[PDB]
Structures are given as structure tokens and as C-alpha cells.
Design a protein around this ligand. Structure first.
Ligand SMILES: NC(=O)c1ccc[n+]([C@@H]2O[C@H](COP(=O)([O-])OP(=O)(O)OC[C@H]3O[C@@H](n4cnc5c(N)ncnc54)[C@H](OP(=O)(O)O)[C@@H]3O)[C@@H](O)[C@H]2O)c1
Ligand SMILES: NC(=O)c1ccc[n+]([C@@H]2O[C@H](COP(=O)([O-])OP(=O)(O)OC[C@H]3O[C@@H](n4cnc5c(N)ncnc54)[C@H](OP(=O)(O)O)[C@@H]3O)[C@@H](O)[C@H]2O)c1
Lengths: 316, 314
């Protein structure tokens, strides 16, 4: 049986693809460039030579996606750009990429008569809501206030607007017949990298390791291992009696405390040590855990990320 | 006297034919490919040079079966696909293969005037019943609820529907022609064929330890060599009929891993699991005819030995 994976060369999508290959699936992975160095890390995957088929598609090109999707039993829409802190993005076109790419993907699956789709969203589509009270522990029923991100300026405002809009489009599309559409919304994703380039979430983790002197927000990070996300996606695809959103955010700490456990597990780096100073920080991943999902302890995720960092020569 | 054997290149069928050749029989073996690569392990069995006669037949091609079967005193229908877990199968076509292939074999047998047939079924056609109570020790008269298997999702559910329906159809047709059925458990043992089958695949699964926590299934077990000699015993004996359960042993996968570690150390056995009363089905109907299976520990240690020599643990 064949499943499609959008952006197979991405941080998350590479582990998704590696895992699905290990389980006997036939993968159709889409990439925007088939050059050997971009796709090297995907070709090397065990089982890939015979059961991995990479296409050159773009989310805004309906035809290329149709070609990559035709004949697939499922498809895992993972492809959405994730802006870096050390850069600027155009909200207009990120919103355009996310929503229109999603619409195209969904149209292609209705055409190819795909049975199940799994859209990878984010907690950014759940938590950013100022009206939801404090005695409320947010879950899969809480949505992000599009009004609020459109009103108030903060980095990743447009990212959140794009993620919520794309996830509402996908979920709502799922209530026809013959088409079950799931959504998974992880929080900040950390873990060892398969791709040669470092992604955004891992870069802000790396930022905390190369100390500086600027005064950062002591934000509360909620975190999940990328390998756990992949196995969650496996679990949600294979089990039939699934429907709706599923939050995957097992761990959560202040940046203060994350630096100190990192310092405790991985000494030998001048970690950043200059912060200053809620509720929602405790969303229940239980809808997932009730299916058997068992995340790994944060220490291993942390230690395996730092050593892949070192292997990539990012620490000198 | 001549006997036919369907899918002679299979895991069980290979042992069936080697044994029958060991006993002076002339065996007509069915395969779907006559290439020397897939038939090599059969050509080498002593007696095959003079007394093995291989035909190219498919269970859904009636005349292929007719050709391989005509002229044989007995038939041993053992050809039925059994899916491996790390792939996917089409239950629709599997169960269609099993039942229609079984029907085709039986029609060919009454056309060729064969006198005895032995169908190889499974405990999957006996145990999977939610209606049967826990106080009841299941035997040869408890059938599987096929609706339940088609309602409940689990890998090998369609396989269970196949074996039950095929075994139902076979013995129904036998009242037309002596038709015996043997229902074995999970089959382990040394392999004669070059490619590993599915049951031995999941034993190799239990041997290569990991971190994922698998189901602590209760496996009922029988040796492939014991299945072969049971089939021989059932065919040679003239006072045999009906179903015969062949499942002498049964253990939890965790206890199974430790008896394996106990007999074969030096391997990173799987050791994280999770979490009955159908576990004591009586093989007495067979054992009363002289069938004496071997202890499970021989079967497993010899199976892992062949795993070793086939280079499957690196
Ligand atoms: N990383 C996190 O912390 C986090 C947290 C929550 C949710 N998520 C979600 O996880 C998913 C994967 O993101 P990631 O973590 O793996 O970071 P990433 O590596 O930057 O993912 C970017 C992927 O999207 C592809 N892409 C971008 N624009 C495309 C387009 N127009 N057409 C086709 N592909 C396009 C990229 O293809 P190329 O390889 O050609 O560049 C790349 O494969 C995203 O949907 C994200 O919202 C991530
Ligand atoms: N394996 C077990 O643990 C187990 C347990 C209980 C019952 N059984 C029963 O034992 C019997 C054989 O299974 P196995 O253990 O020996 O695994 P196996 O090696 O995979 O047996 C498959 C055999 O069936 C043949 N086959 C499949 N479709 C066919 C078709 N359309 N036409 C002709 N032949 C076809 C195959 O021919 P090729 O060789 O050419 O592919 C092969 O010989 C089955 O009836 C099974 O229900 C097995």
C-alpha cells in the first residue's frame, strides 16, 4: 500500500518517511528539487531504493501534486514553511502557500480517491487565544483567535494565521464521505536531524547553547521529539477509529530550566544565561496517549539533538 | 501409489514432500514457477530425482490443478498464502484464493476420482469466536465467527475468514470422497525453502530486540516437522476423518523469549511487552492415533539454528 508525503526532505518529513519505509509502506515523497545533495539523505534510507519514489512537485502547482498522489491509499500533508527567528518572511505568501497548497492537496486526493489524509498543524493553531479563561486547560477543542493574531503584532503571527486557516480548511473538508481527514498539532519540535540543513526550531534550541548577552524572554516552551511525532503519525494513520485533532506536546519548561537541564546533561557549551521572569503550559496530549502513543523522556531527545548538532559542526 | 501436494515449495509443503519421498511415495508437486532457483531445495531431497514430478499449477486455474492431480490416489492441499506482517495483503483476494482454490482442488479430485484429500487449515478457523465462553475448552467442533473477524480489525482477520470459510467449504463438499482437515497452531521449525516465511519471520522479530512495546500475545505452537508427520499419519491411517487439532504447546511471548534465551543465549532478545483460557485446546484426537509431537524447545532451538546458518542475525 502506498502513501504520499509532502516535502519529504523536510525535518519532520524525513523521519516520517524513514519510519514508514521501515514498516513496509511504499512512499511517494514530493520535493521541490531532485538534486542529489538535497535528496541524498532520503535515498540512503533503508528500504528507500525499492519503495521510495520521489517526485518534483510544488504545493501551488495542482498538476504536479496530482501526479505524485495518484494511486496512493493515504497522504501525509507535512509541507508548510516554518520561519526562522534570524530572518524575515512574507506573511502574505506564507498564508498563500499554506492554505492554497492545502486546498490543492485536498482536491488531488478527492480526484485520486484517497481514503485518509493527515494534516500536520501546530499548537500555534490551538493556544493563541486571549479570550479563553485561565481556569481552562486547553485541549483539541480550543482554536486560535484569527482576530487576535491579525490585530496584535508578534513574531509568528502570520504563521499562526496560516496554520489555523489551513487546519480549519482540512478538518472541514473531512466531513464528506469516503474521506477521513485527521489533524495533528505538535508544539516546538526538537530532535536529531536527517536533512543536511538545520531547521528553525532546532536553530532556536541551538541559539540557547551559544550564549550571548542580550536579554531574552524566559518563554515557556512546550516540546516534542520529532521521532515521537513520526510514530504518532504512524499510529494515527494505521488506526481507523480516528477523527479530529490530536495534540502532541508531552513536555514543557521555562527556557531558564531548559538551559539548566541541558547544562546538566550536556556540559561543555557557554549556554545563554540572561532571561527575565502561566497556565495553558499544560495541554493534555491524552487523546493521543489513549491510542498507545508513548513519548520518550526529554533527556534523550535533548542529548541526541546536541550530538547531531556536533556532527553537523554547528558548535565551534 | 501417487499423491499430489499443492504449493510444494512452501514452508510446510517442503517438509511434507521430503517426508513422503522418504516413504517411497510418488508425489506430484504443484508450484507457480518452475525456475531452478525456487525448486532447488526440492530437487535435492533424496527420492526427488526419480519420484518427484513437478507441475506448474495455480489454484485459480482449474485445469492446471486437474493436470497435476489426475492419476494420484491422494491429495494434500496445503497451498494457501499466509501474509507476512511487515507488508500488506488484500484480504478480498486472499480469502478468494483460499476458498476458490480449495473448491477447484476438490472438483478436480472428484473428477480424477481421488480417494482421500487432506486440507491444511489453521486454529484461526477454530478459536476466533467471541460467542464461545471461557469455561469451554474448544475442540474440533467450535468454529470461528467470521462476522466477528470482519467486524473487528486486526492483522490476519481476513486470513482467519479465509481459513474458516475454506475449511467450512471443504468438509461440506466431503459429503459428496473422504476429506480430512488438520488445524495447526502457529508453525515454527527449520526451513527448507530459501526465503523465510511469516511465522518464522515473527520469531526472528522476537529475536531482534528493540524499544517498541509489542503485544504479549499468547502463541500456540507446533513444529513444522511434526505437522508433516501428522499429515503422513492422517493419510496412512484409514480410520481417520473430520478435523484434527495439532497444537501441542502454548506460551506467552515473554515466557517464550526467556525459554529461547535459556536454550539459545548470545542474542539481544526483545524484552518489553504489555498485559487467557482458550490456551488448552486438546490435541488428543491426533495423539490417540499415535501422533507424538516433539517438545517445543527442540523446535525453537533448531529454528534459531537455521536462522543462524541462513545469516538472518547480523
Ligand atoms: N519544527 C517545529 O517546531 C514545528 C512545530 C509545529 C508544527 N510544525 C509543522 O511541521 C511541518 C514540517 O515542518 P518542519 O518542522 O519539518 O520544518 P522544515 O524543514 O522547514 O519544513 C519545510 C518543508 O516544507 C517544504 N516546502 C516549503 N514550501 C513548499 C512548497 N511551496 N511546495 C512544496 N514544499 C514546500 C519544503 O520543501 P524543500 O525541502 O524543497 O525546502 C520542506 O520540505 C510544518 O507543517 C510545521 O507547521 C513544525
Ligand atoms: N506458516 C504458519 O505458521 C501456518 C500456520 C497455520 C496454518 N498454516 C497453513 O500452511 C499452509 C502453508 O503456509 P506456509 O506456512 O507454508 O507459508 P508459505 O510458504 O508462504 O506458503 C504459501 C504457499 O502457498 C502457494 N500459493 C499462494 N497462492 C497460490 C496460488 N494462487 N496458487 C498456487 N499456490 C499459491 C505458494 O506458492 P509459491 O511457493 O509459488 O509462492 C506457497 O507455496 C497454509 O495453508 C496455511 O494456512 C500455516
Amino acid at each position: 500500500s502506498r502513501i504520499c508525503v509532502t516535502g519529504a526532505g523536510g525535518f519532520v518529513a524525513s523521519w516520517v518517511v524513514k519510519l514508514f519505509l521501515s514498516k513496509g509502506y511504499l512512499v511517494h515523497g514530493t520535493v521541490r528539487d531532485l538534486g542529489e545533495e538535497k535528496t541524498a539523505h532520503l535515498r540512503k534510507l533503508e528500504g528507500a531504493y525499492h519503495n521510495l519514489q520521489l517526485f518534483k512537485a510544488d504545493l501551488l502547482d495542482y498538476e504536479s501534486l496530482l501526479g505524485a498522489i495518484t494511486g496512493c491509499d493515504g497522504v501525509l500533508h507535512v509541507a508548510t514553511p516554518v520561519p526562522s527567528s534570524k530572518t524575515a518572511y512574507s506573511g502574505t505568501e506564507l498564508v498563500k502557500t499554506a492554505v492554497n497548497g492545502t486546498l490543492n492537496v485536498l482536491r488531488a486526493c478527492t480526484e485520486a480517491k484517497v481514503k485518509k489524509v493527515i494534516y500536520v498543524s501546530s499548537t500555534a493553531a490551538v493556544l493563541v487565544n486571549p479570550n479563553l479563561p485561565k481556569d481552562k486547560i486547553p485541549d483539541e477543542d480550543c482554536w486560535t483567535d484569527e482576530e487576535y493574531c491579525r490585530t496584535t503584532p508578534f513574531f509568528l503571527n502570520w504563521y499562526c494565521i496560516a496554520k489555523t486557516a489551513a487546519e480549519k480548511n482540512a478538518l472541514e473538508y473531512g466531513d464528506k464521505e469516503g474521506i477521513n481527514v485527521i489533524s495533528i498539532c505538535p508544539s516546538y519540535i526538537f530532535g536529531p536531524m536527517l536533512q543536511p540543513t538545520i531547521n528553525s526550531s532546532n536553530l532556536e534550541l541551538l541559539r540557547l547553547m551559544k550564549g550571548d548577552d542580550e536579554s531574552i524572554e524566559n518563554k515557556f516552551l512546550l516540546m516534542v521529539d520529532v521521532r515521537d511525532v513520526a510514530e504518532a503519525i504512524l499510529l494515527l494513520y494505521e488506526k481507523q477509529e480516528t477523527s479530529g485533532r490530536y495534540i502532541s506536546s508531552p513536555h514543557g519548561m521555562r527556557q531558564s530550566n531548559l538551559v539548566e537541564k541541558l547544562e546538566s546533561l550536556q556540559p561543555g557549551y557557554n549556554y545563554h544565561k540572561n532571561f527575565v521572569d502561566p497556565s495553558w503550559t499544560m495541554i493534555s496530549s491524552e487523546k493521543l496517549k489513549k491510542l498507545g502513543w508513548k513519548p520518550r523522556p526529554l533527556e534523550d531527545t535533548i542529548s541526541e539533538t546536541v550530538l547531531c548538532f556536533e556532527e553537523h559542526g554547528l558548535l565551534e
